[PDB]
Every structure is written in C-alpha cells, then in structure tokens.
Design an enzyme around this catalytic site. Structure first.
Site, PDB file in Angstrom:
ATOM      1  N   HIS B  38       0.544  -0.755  -0.305  1.00 20.54           N
ATOM      2  CA  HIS B  38      -0.224  -0.262   0.246  1.00 20.54           C
ATOM      3  C   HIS B  38       0.604   1.295   0.090  1.00 20.54           C
ATOM      4  CE1 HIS B  38       0.180  -0.890   4.320  1.00 20.54           C
ATOM      5  NE2 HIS B  38       0.027   0.383   4.533  1.00 20.54           N
ATOM      6  N   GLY B 139       1.939   5.921  10.662  1.00 20.93           N
ATOM      7  CA  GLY B 139       3.351   5.098  10.490  1.00 20.93           C
ATOM      8  C   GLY B 139       4.414   4.318  11.168  1.00 20.93           C
ATOM      9  N   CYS B 141       3.593   0.910   9.723  1.00 24.12           N
ATOM     10  CA  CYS B 141       3.656  -0.008   8.534  1.00 24.12           C
ATOM     11  C   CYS B 141       5.151   0.054   8.317  1.00 24.12           C
ATOM     12  CB  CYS B 141       3.020   0.353   7.505  1.00 24.12           C
ATOM     13  SG  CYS B 141       1.170   0.455   7.936  1.00 24.12           S
TER      14      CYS B 141
HETATM   15  C1  80I Z   1     -11.441   2.580   6.860  1.00 24.88           C
HETATM   16  O1  80I Z   1     -11.425   1.745   7.184  1.00 24.88           O
HETATM   17  C2  80I Z   1     -11.174   1.141   8.333  1.00 24.88           C
HETATM   18  C3  80I Z   1     -12.331   0.461   9.031  1.00 24.88           C
HETATM   19  C4  80I Z   1     -11.169  -0.148  10.173  1.00 24.88           C
HETATM   20  C5  80I Z   1     -10.711  -0.571  10.533  1.00 24.88           C
HETATM   21  C6  80I Z   1      -9.348  -0.263   9.689  1.00 24.88           C
HETATM   22  N1  80I Z   1      -8.346  -0.275   9.122  1.00 24.88           N
HETATM   23  C7  80I Z   1      -7.672   0.125   8.288  1.00 24.88           C
HETATM   24  C8  80I Z   1      -6.158   0.355   8.635  1.00 24.88           C
HETATM   25  O2  80I Z   1      -5.311   0.123   9.311  1.00 24.88           O
HETATM   26  N2  80I Z   1      -5.342   0.754   7.463  1.00 24.88           N
HETATM   27  C9  80I Z   1      -4.084   0.937   7.130  1.00 24.88           C
HETATM   28  C10 80I Z   1      -3.731   0.954   6.033  1.00 24.88           C
HETATM   29  C11 80I Z   1      -4.231   0.001   4.577  1.00 24.88           C
HETATM   30  C12 80I Z   1      -5.305   0.203   4.281  1.00 24.88           C
HETATM   31  C13 80I Z   1      -3.541   0.599   3.531  1.00 24.88           C
HETATM   32  C14 80I Z   1      -3.165   1.723   8.110  1.00 24.88           C
HETATM   33  O3  80I Z   1      -3.970   2.697   8.182  1.00 24.88           O
HETATM   34  N3  80I Z   1      -2.012   1.173   8.653  1.00 24.88           N
HETATM   35  C15 80I Z   1      -1.237   1.881   9.309  1.00 24.88           C
HETATM   36  C16 80I Z   1      -0.963   0.950  10.494  1.00 24.88           C
HETATM   37  C17 80I Z   1      -1.938   1.052  12.071  1.00 24.88           C
HETATM   38  C18 80I Z   1      -2.639   3.081  11.773  1.00 24.88           C
HETATM   39  C19 80I Z   1      -2.905   3.043  13.128  1.00 24.88           C
HETATM   40  N4  80I Z   1      -2.064   2.596  13.745  1.00 24.88           N
HETATM   41  C20 80I Z   1      -2.210   1.178  13.288  1.00 24.88           C
HETATM   42  O4  80I Z   1      -0.756  -0.382  13.341  1.00 24.88           O
HETATM   43  C21 80I Z   1       0.630   2.534   8.609  1.00 24.88           C
HETATM   44  O5  80I Z   1       1.824   2.459   9.085  1.00 24.88           O
HETATM   45  C22 80I Z   1       0.217   2.251   7.459  1.00 24.88           C
HETATM   46  O6  80I Z   1      -0.459   3.506   7.215  1.00 24.88           O
HETATM   47  P1  80I Z   1       0.054   5.543   7.577  1.00 24.88           P
HETATM   48  O7  80I Z   1       0.659   5.710   6.179  1.00 24.88           O
HETATM   49  O8  80I Z   1       1.338   5.368   8.521  1.00 24.88           O
HETATM   50  O9  80I Z   1      -1.119   6.289   7.997  1.00 24.88           O
HETATM   51  C23 80I Z   1      -9.268   1.420   7.509  1.00 24.88           C
HETATM   52  C24 80I Z   1      -9.603   0.753   8.548  1.00 24.88           C
END
Ligand code: 80I
Ligand code: 80I
Lengths: 299, 297
Positions: B38, B139, B141
């Site tokens: 992603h 951040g 991920c």
């Molecule tokens: C809105 O629909 C939803 C509904 C219910 C639950 C859901 N959960 C997620 C999700 O988890 N989404 C991934 C991104 C994917 C889908 C592309 C994400 O947010 N990953 C984080 C780690 C996360 C950030 C907070 N704590 C962590 O562990 C990264 O590190 C990369 O993202 P960033 O660039 O750092 O913001 C979407 C969602």
C-alpha cells in the site's frame, strides 16, 4: 493498545564484553578505553564476608581476561570505585555511543539489556521501585548487565546489575558505583522495604483506558489530592504530585486527576472480573511519558 | 517477565521508504527492500485496485533512505500484499537470515519503527485469530517481526493494519497476510480469540518452580475432558504434552493437575495472585519459561 516496550538495544550491544578474573566470569561495559563491571568479580571466596580492600591489594592484572566478541583486550590498569571496577584497556571502543551517566530516581523507567558470557540475550523495560529494587528476570551470569535510557540522541547509562535478593528482587548500582537503596555487595541475606504502588503511573494508566474507550469504572466524584494522600499513606500507594504534568491528558479527555484518584481508591478492591485495558488489577507500569508517546507520538 | 530478544541485528536493516507523500518503513536485506504494497496506493481512503495502482506506479516517486544515504531503485515487483524493491546497493550489515511463516500460538519480537527509525521493541504471540496485541500508530507500517535462533535472524512479520477492535495484523515476507485480512480501508472483524492452553500450563509450571502453589490441588482432569471444557469456554485444546513431560518430571506435578486448576482458576483468583498476576496469563510459551528460568532453549 498499550504495551510495555524497551527502547532499542543496538547502541548498547556493541559495548558489552565478557570480564574474566581467576575463577569468576561476568559482564562488563566497554566505553572509550574503560571497562566497567561489578567489583565482586575479583573476590576469590564469597562464602563469608568480603574485605574488598584486601581483595583489591592482592589483585594482579594478569588474572584478567576481557573479550569483545572474539577479540581479547589488553588490560593496563584497574581501580575500584564504590561497588564497581574501572578497568583500563589498551584499545578504545570505536563503537562507543554518545553517552552520559545518570542516577535513577524513585519510580523512573529504564531499560535492561540482560547479558550472559558477554553477549546480550534479552531486553525489557522496567521501573525503579520505591524500595530501590526492580522486578527483573536474571539467572546466574547476569552480573554487569547494563540498564540504559535513550534521550536526545544520547545513551544514558543508569544501572549495573549486581545482586538478587532473598525475595527474588534485583539490585544494581549506578555507574558511579553507588548501590541503589544502599544494599551491600556481600553474600548474606538482606531484606528490602515494602514496595509502594506508583500513584502517578496508575493515573496515567487510567487516562489511557479513557482514551481507548474503557470507561465503565469512571464516576463523576472528585477526591482532593490532599485527601487521597492521607489514604495512600495507609494503603501502600505513593502520594500524588505533579498534577500539572497531566494537563495534556486531562485536555484530550476532559477528565480531571481528582476523579481518577477517587477511582484508584474504589478499584483497589478489585475489578470484579471486568478488565481495564486487559488487566485484572491496577497497573503502575506505565508513566505519563509512555502513555503519551504510545498514543500520540509526542515525546 | 516478558522480554524481547535484542534488536541490534535488525536495526541496521530498517529503512525509510517514501512514495510520493506516503512514508513508511522498509526492510533492507541484500539488494532488496521489502515493504507493504500500500505504499504505492493513491487514496488509502476508498477501495484500492492494486493491479491498477501497480500499473501506474512510477519509480522516480520512490525515495529510500538508510541513515544518511539514498538507495537507487532499479526495479520493483509486487508479491501478495508486499513490494520487493530492487536497489543498486547491497546492505553490508545484512545478517544471516531466513524467512518463516508463524503458526498459531508462536511468540516473536516486534521492532516498532517510525520514519525508518526504531523506537521500541517488545515480545508478542500470534494469537489463534491471527492478530497480535500490539501498540502502533500512524507510520508504523512495515515494522518487522523477528526471532533470533541458531545464529540467524528469522524474519516473520511485516506490520500492515489496525483492526477496528484495536488488534493488529501483518503479513509474512512472502506477501501472505496473516489471517487472510485484506489491505483495504474497510471494517473487518476477526474471529473470537482463544486462551492458549499450552501457555497457561507453562505459566502454572513457572508458578510451581517459584514456590507459588496455593492454587494447586490433588485432583486430576484428563486431557480429553479438559478439551471438551475448553471448546466451550474459549480455550485451546491441550497439545504437545512432550516438553511438559520434562517439567512434570522435575516438579512432580502431572499436566492433568494443572488442567484442573485452569478450569477452577478461570472463574477468578479469589483476591489472591499468581506471580503477581491477578488472572490466568497465556502470554508465556513453554520455551520462554524454560529459557528464562533455566537458561536453555
Ligand atoms: C477506514 O477503514 C477502516 C475501518 C476499520 C478499521 C481500519 N483499519 C484500517 C487500517 O489499518 N489501514 C491501514 C492502511 C491500509 C488499508 C492501506 C493503516 O492505516 N496502516 C497503518 C498502521 C496502523 C495505523 C494506525 N495504527 C496502525 O497500526 C500504517 O502504518 C500505514 O498507514 P500510514 O501511512 O502510517 O497512515 C482501515 C480501517
Ligand atoms: C548467602 O548469601 C545470600 C543469601 C540470600 C540471598 C543472596 N543473594 C546473593 C547475591 O545476589 N549474590 C551476588 C554476588 C554477591 C555475593 C557478591 C550474585 O550472585 N549475583 C549474580 C546475579 C544473581 C544470581 C541469580 N540471579 C541474579 O540476579 C551474578 O551474576 C553475579 O555473580 P555470579 O554470576 O552469580 O557468579 C547472595 C545471597
């Protein structure tokens, strides 16, 4: 969520060495051209009281062997400083990090690198308790394992592991050579004072529960800091202070400290099978700093 | 005491991966940077067509930083929910390593990283519902999970998502998301978690070895009867009684007495405590207990 984390160990691992003296092996810390380690490494006989001035006067430098990874280091001199030895070696550790030395205060968090035979095996975060002991996990061979903190691009060295008390609690010294709590590096029973629950860490834990949405324990009544402190003296909790530090947490939630101090009093009898952030009793593991960094990324 | 294995060998392998305005962590081994796919998605807000995102990917949008140095991207390919980014530069600090996929129940270590820099390290278990109890914010991920074993680093986990429950989900480095979760912004609900019975038995054997034995009675619960109770009370079945035979031999306490204790202690500790815990604890594996108390793997 909220997990008890260690700060990374990489800078520290490059400094750990194996210190052999005669019939004893333990761990040392190699910084610049000095190796720091517990002074009991030179005690030949530890089944009665150790006269460290005598042991020091009979010490011969050729009985040392100091090993970094697979390399022997040449020993040039050795001096005694409180409960530590400072061993001068002919080589400078070119991986010596930017560092200082600091002495932990009551209740402060730090990290332990548990080492054996001069090699790191585990790392964990831990708090210096009010009785100057820690709840570690050490077996024989762990002496000299260092405790540290990372702050402002610098390693602060704060703990050198020394002894395990009859109760299972662990005692170390600063790198100045002062044993935390005044315990002796002598082979005999010593009893620590009773531990106190750290009130400011329990408050931070309860804010964490609010931010994570676990609010079932929360009422609206306030308990004045002064009224709480009289109750804490009689129930094994530390007094409350630094309420102003909780500004950040109180703002984001809209809940004041004095409501949580009320909750601390009530919840001390048990969670009744309910679980707050997944614990079945009050937790004083987490400081304000940790809650705030883990929830918001702000130092 | 829960601890992690030391992080030094892994810290030198983490890099900061930027694609456009998206920043996250990558793992630099040899001449490959591994990271979540992603990183190339345009809107992490609505549904993602990754085949389309990969076709419009432009490699000059990448910037990969290790410490102070920039790495030169020469290609990128997509495998499952990960990207393998080939660079000109070989990581001279690459440790002896392999890749491995975790089974249900297995413990490992997480190096939580942000902007390509390690911030903390902690031990976790892959739970039976294929999530982990972690601590992560935006951040994180790409943060790696690892084990140290037999003179090499086993890389097992790449952080990817936080579920609406707060539980955390990653992929292996072959691109397979643990649990089959999707790297999409939609609500997905994991199945019910189970208490890991072998870990709870490991914990009670730890309690016995430390002289904490108030809870221990004489009655015996046969494995098949326990497993019937387990399937209805949110516990895993009892398995692998082999390493426990060693502990049973040393302590004089057979596993059947501990299975009975679980059945009783599940209804609460009655006020008392076990190794300072106020309730049954399944965070420690038999390996962790043996390693921490006797020093052997
Ligand atoms: C809105 O629909 C939803 C509904 C219910 C639950 C859901 N959960 C997620 C999700 O988890 N989404 C991934 C991104 C994917 C889908 C592309 C994400 O947010 N990953 C984080 C780690 C996360 C950030 C907070 N704590 C962590 O562990 C990264 O590190 C990369 O993202 P960033 O660039 O750092 O913001 C979407 C969602
Ligand atoms: C009869 O006397 C006692 C009675 C009741 C309680 C007692 N406690 C100690 C004590 O703590 N003794 C120090 C050395 C002193 C005597 C100078 C020690 O044993 N430290 C270990 C780490 C320890 C070992 C297991 N878990 C650890 O944390 C080292 O690693 C360094 O030396 P060793 O590696 O064992 O050779 C003596 C004693």
């Amino acid at each position: 969520g909220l997990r008890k984390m260690a700060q990374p160990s990489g800078f520290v691992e490059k400094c750990v060495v194996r210190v052999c003296y005669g019939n004893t092996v333990l761990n040392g810390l190699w910084l610049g051209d000095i190796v720091y380690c517990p002074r009991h490494v030179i005690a030949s006989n530890t089944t009665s009281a150790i006269d460290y001035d005598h042991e020091y006067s009979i010490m011969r430098l050729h009985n040392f062997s100091i090993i970094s990874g697979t390399a022997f280091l040449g020993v040039v001199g050795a001096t005694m400083h409180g409960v530590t030895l400072k061993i001068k070696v002919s080589q400078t550790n070119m991986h010596t990090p930017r560092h200082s030395f600091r002495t932990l205060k009551s209740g402060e968090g730090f990290n332990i690198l548990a080492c054996y035979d001069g090699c790191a095996q585990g790392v964990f975060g831990v708090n210096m308790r009010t009785n100057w002991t820690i709840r570690g996990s050490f077996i024989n061979g762990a002496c000299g394992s260092p405790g540290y903190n990372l702050k402002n691009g610098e390693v602060e060295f704060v703990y050198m592991h020394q002894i395990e008390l009859g109760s299972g609690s662990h005692v170390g010294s600063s790198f100045d050579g002062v044993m935390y709590g005044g315990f002796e590096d002598q082979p005999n029973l010593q009893v620590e004072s009773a531990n106190q629950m750290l009130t400011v860490n329990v408050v931070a834990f309860l804010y964490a529960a609010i931010l994570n949405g676990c609010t079932w324990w929360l009422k609206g009544e306030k308990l004045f800091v002064e009224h709480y402190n009289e109750w804490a003296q009689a129930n094994g909790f530390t007094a409350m202070n630094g309420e102003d530090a909780f500004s950040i947490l109180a703002a984001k939630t809209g809940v004041c400290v004095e409501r949580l101090l009320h909750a601390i009093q009530v919840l001390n009898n048990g969670f009744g099978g309910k679980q707050i952030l997944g614990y079945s009793s009050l937790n004083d593991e987490f400081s304000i700093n940790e809650v705030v960094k883990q929830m918001f990324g702000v130092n």
